[PDB]
Design a protein around this ligand. Structure first.
Ligand SMILES: CC(=O)N[C@@H]1[C@@H](O)[C@H](O[C@@H]2O[C@H](CO)[C@H](O)[C@H](O)[C@H]2O)[C@@H](CO)O[C@H]1O
Ligand SMILES: O=c1ccn([C@@H]2O[C@H](COP(=O)(O)OP(=O)(O)O)[C@@H](O)[C@H]2O)c(=O)[nH]1
Ligand SMILES: O=c1ccn([C@@H]2O[C@H](COP(=O)(O)OP(=O)(O)O)[C@@H](O)[C@H]2O)c(=O)[nH]1
Ligand SMILES: [Mn+2]
Length: 287
């Protein structure tokens, strides 16, 4: 089987956090041996999935740029399947795909509140895992559409359960993190607890693990509805509670999901994905 030291050298990045207390790697540029891993996973003949949602004007603003960039940069050299969930298939951009990429598209119901569009992804992803994704892929990523791939996002990111460090908070102390802090919410994390602040824009794992992630988060979302409370950062609050309880087996550095509004500091050596500028006045239709 694969050993961590076969592909991961933390000493290449001595000035950042490269290992967690529960022995998961934090993958930074310089630490990974992609050649070793490409050879390993090609011998297993893996396929990698990617889900993305675009509901409303998120389709026109973001979906083409997301997919064009994913085609170029996501798991190059391996078969990939893009799963695209939209409310209006007639507005789908049908871009040309390259070798080892294919896709399929699903029509979904548009939830009335943007907060519920975001949170209902957890329910829909689990339904699709059970119905087909579990039979199609070895690993799955679930991503926001309001971002663009900038460089290779490869097999060094694969694992049983994979979390993303949020770009603005990776050096912060846990008591500064924007976790949900009301005990009445299923997402509550008390002061004095927490490892990292994870970004809900990227998470992944085997289909089995992603099913558990998404099912447990959606259970918390529904429980909160019954208690008349809505977590401060919606599905992200619940995801952070999940990963506190069920530690990820791999974490990605902020290089894998970077906000250029921060600037480009010394620690961010090669950006693999960048955030799109927010445009909520146009793309969201409720407060
Ligand atoms: C240090 C600080 O306050 N930085 C904020 C960012 O947190 C903020 O990003 C939003 O962060 C929330 C969680 O707090 C969530 O992850 C959102 O998806 C994300 O956009 C950013 C927004 O422009 O502003 C900075 O000032
Ligand atoms: O009206 C909506 C609200 C959300 N989304 C999807 O849900 C994700 C999360 O919402 P958003 O990116 O707006 O949250 P932010 O990252 O800005 O906090 C988006 O990237 C889209 O994939 C969408 O398609 N339409
Ligand atoms: O139909 C509704 C809308 C809200 N609320 C309660 O507070 C949450 C906020 O509701 P939302 O508008 O987000 O609707 P829902 O997700 O139920 O479609 C709900 O789930 C309910 O528990 C209400 O009692 N009924
Ligand atoms: Mn987003």
């Amino acid at each position: 089987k694969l050993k961590l030291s076969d592909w991961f050298n933390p000493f290449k990045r001595p000035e950042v956090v490269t290992m967690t207390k529960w022995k998961a790697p934090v993958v930074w540029e310089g630490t990974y041996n992609r050649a070793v891993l490409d050879n390993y996973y090609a011998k297993q003949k893996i396929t990698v999935g990617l889900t993305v949602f675009a509901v409303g004007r998120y389709i026109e603003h973001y979906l083409e740029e997301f997919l064009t960039s994913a085609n170029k940069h996501f798991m190059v050299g391996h078969p990939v399947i893009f799963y695209i969930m939209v409310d209006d298939v007639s507005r789908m951009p049908l871009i040309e795909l390259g070798p080892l990429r294919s896709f399929k598209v699903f029509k979904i119901k548009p939830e009335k509140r943007w907060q519920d569009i975001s949170m209902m992804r957890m329910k829909t992803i689990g339904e699709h895992i059970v119905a087909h994704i579990q039979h199609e892929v070895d690993f799955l990523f679930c991503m926001d559409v309001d971002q663009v791939f900038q460089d290779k996002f490869g097999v060094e990111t694969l694992g049983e359960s994979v979390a993303q460090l949020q770009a603005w908070w990776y050096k912060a102390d846990p008591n500064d993190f924007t976790y949900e802090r009301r005990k009445e919410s299923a997402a509550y994390i008390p002061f004095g607890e927490g490892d990292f602040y994870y970004h809900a824009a990227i998470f992944g794992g085997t289909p089995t693990q992603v099913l558990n992630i998404t099912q447990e988060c959606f259970k918390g979302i529904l429980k909160d509805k019954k208690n008349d409370i809505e977590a401060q950062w919606h599905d992200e609050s619940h995801l952070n509670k999940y990963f506190l309880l069920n530690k990820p087996t791999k974490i990605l550095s902020p290089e894998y999901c970077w906000d250029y509004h921060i600037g480009l500091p010394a620690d961010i050596k090669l950006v693999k994905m960048s955030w799109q500028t927010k445009e909520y006045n146009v793309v969201r239709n409720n407060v």
